[PDB]
Write a protein that binds this ligand. Sequence first.
Ligand SMILES: C[S@@+](CC[C@H](N)C(=O)[O-])C[C@H]1O[C@@H](n2cnc3c(N)ncnc32)[C@H](O)[C@@H]1O
Ligand SMILES: C[S@@+](CC[C@H](N)C(=O)[O-])C[C@H]1O[C@@H](n2cnc3c(N)ncnc32)[C@H](O)[C@@H]1O
Lengths: 393, 393
Amino acid sequence: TKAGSLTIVGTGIESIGQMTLQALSYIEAAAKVFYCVIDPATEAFILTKNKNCVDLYQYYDNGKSRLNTYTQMSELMVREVRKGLDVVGVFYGHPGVFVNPSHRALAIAKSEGYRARMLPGVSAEDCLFADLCIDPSNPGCLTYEASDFLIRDRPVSIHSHLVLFQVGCVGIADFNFTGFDNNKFGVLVDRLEQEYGAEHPVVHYIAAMMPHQDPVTDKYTVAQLREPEIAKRVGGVSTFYIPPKARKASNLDIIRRLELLPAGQVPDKKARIYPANQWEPDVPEVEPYRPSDQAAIAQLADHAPPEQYQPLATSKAMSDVMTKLALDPKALADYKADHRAFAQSVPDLTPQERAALELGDSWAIRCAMKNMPSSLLDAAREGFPAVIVVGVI
Amino acid sequence: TKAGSLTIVGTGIESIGQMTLQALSYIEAAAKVFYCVIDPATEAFILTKNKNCVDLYQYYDNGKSRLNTYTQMSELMVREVRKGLDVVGVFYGHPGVFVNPSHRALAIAKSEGYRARMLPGVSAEDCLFADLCIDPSNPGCLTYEASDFLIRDRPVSIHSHLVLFQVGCVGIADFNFTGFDNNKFGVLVDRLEQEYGAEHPVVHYIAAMMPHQDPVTDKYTVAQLREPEIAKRVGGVSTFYIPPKARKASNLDIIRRLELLPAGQVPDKKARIYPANQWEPDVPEVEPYRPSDQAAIAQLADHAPPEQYQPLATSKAMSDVMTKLALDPKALADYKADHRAFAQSVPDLTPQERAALELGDSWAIRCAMKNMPSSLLDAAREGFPAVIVVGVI
Ligand SMILES: C[S@@+](CC[C@H](N)C(=O)[O-])C[C@H]1O[C@@H](n2cnc3c(N)ncnc32)[C@H](O)[C@@H]1O
Ligand SMILES: C[S@@+](CC[C@H](N)C(=O)[O-])C[C@H]1O[C@@H](n2cnc3c(N)ncnc32)[C@H](O)[C@@H]1O
């Protein structure tokens, strides 16, 4: 009911392309846009999409506390919210991943009774998984801010992924336009030596910021980070990935309780699913085409869709309206305000489609857009989407 | 040089809107698309963008090992790569976050000498940060697959965020179209009780999959998860967030070595930056407008952009070409093949813009698109973007 909203969105890391469709649509719909991005092509792109933009980066200054900058950035956004405007804040990457002023501004807006939401974006860590070819699930992921990691002595796990952000400004609370003098970097390297050993790998990671660039994926030993020529390459957009040192064994009690109980030769702790993590030291070669793989592939020739598979069975009118709700914030607001009024004015919907939109229930819409076989609903329960694309062990 | 490529992309979690612009452009450019998504509107959207799509979900079956399904999914993609086609695989969320077949297919493609890349997307964890209003940086984040968490007895940190994926299929290696009988869920709850206590909060999180839905953000005690009516709400798209139990103190030796050495009352371990994590038990109220905040806000009236701030100073022709490189994979390929030939045929570029594109160097492009003040380059070094938007302590 109250006038004014704050939506904070991301641009992703790589220029323009890593912005989500909804981030773009909210930027276009906004009364006022406040942005903090790294690359100028993304900045130029944003300015073509809204006429009323303000660069938040101008609120940094040499020797000025970053906290003071963050309070100001937040306040610039919330001031416009209080005037009754639909405000969009834009931060590079994911706007809530290692970002102070977004969370501050949203919390203030929410506490004062305004609509407040963060839309997720693609983070530097998302880029890291993609470029280093690792999955956080295998074998778990610990993610820290590098100064916090040291100051609070945060735990490492030698059996899991370790990701460290802000390794180029260790112990630095202020700002400089010409970059950080990272002279406490040696304190980080000492901690990494204690935890992993001097010959354990550390990957210096920088995601490509422009579409034609390759990422920096440079493997060094912990010891090599002490070399001045290597240490100087670490800057404000550098992230470290430290791979596990070993594989963790299975817990017998849990094997029993989960009834994985052909316990004899439940694949040995080093019997990896292809592909193995290529950054992990002394990682053995894993066969991609084992006899079991070859047999699975042989079944493709005779494959038919299972009885209980639900083929898409929708219409242009329904796909058009579902697309509009996702890509037009104004249409979404209209729909949310009055499902029935909105649904009844959508042209060319079938009766079922109209009814599904009137209700708004997830299952009714899914039911309108997919043919649910009788085989399924004889077994199925009166949400259950069920799309699980990773299997551990 | 070799014909055939594999690009694996994501759709994000929320229908359509959380797809990145580059994911969309690669889907449109592909010779063949293979997809595995949850919601039918996203499926319908994909089918409007390419004429040659295959749903990978049909390769699941009741009682069929998920590993066999993953081998088949991978093989369907790589077969088309081997024929010399530009293939795009599409997985919901981030396609390398808790996904087996993407990493398998990319690794095989790369080993056989084909172009292979994963484009990052918005994961369920990205959504979690946005919807639960937390930052992984404060106070660090541990992320695990729930079965792996139990089977390998993965460590928790009571001072950091804990995120658990696949809490609805604990110990289950196969599949069923009507969903999982999660009868080993109690084993997870036992572990959470041991680590956190019976009265510690656990947030049941489900990101909205359709644009009009609200997320599920239901806080329960560990003990409440044993209640059958609560346990049954946990399904195949459920993720758990467990907040920290306490704040970790600072390490005196590191305070010394980082020279944060007005050590007396360096803000006490509970002197939080606003806003506090609202899920953390017994979290004190944090003042958003302290005297220091009010003073920072008072400086806004007299603010001018700093000397060393670099205003955007580009052209429509340059912003157009940088946008085209990000949004048109064919143009990007042409540019990467011959920078000079491509640059010289771009209409209306200035000499500097043309020269910057010919080189392709990050700094030359930035220099062409931003006015670098003399004040900056008198101090600055001959990349240093420097955009750091979070400050710990
Ligand atoms: C203030 S934080 C903001 C992170 C951003 N919100 C995100 O979603 O990744 C800055 C830190 O992000 C990481 N980062 C930013 N750009 C990066 C890039 N191109 N490659 C790798 N890491 C990057 C670095 O660790 C950097 O010090
Ligand atoms: C096979 S994984 C795939 C994850 C996906 N690639 C991603 O980027 O998040 C499935 C797990 O993701 C999480 N997940 C999927 N959809 C979700 C949603 N709408 N909300 C919360 N978690 C979700 C759940 O933990 C689920 O068991």
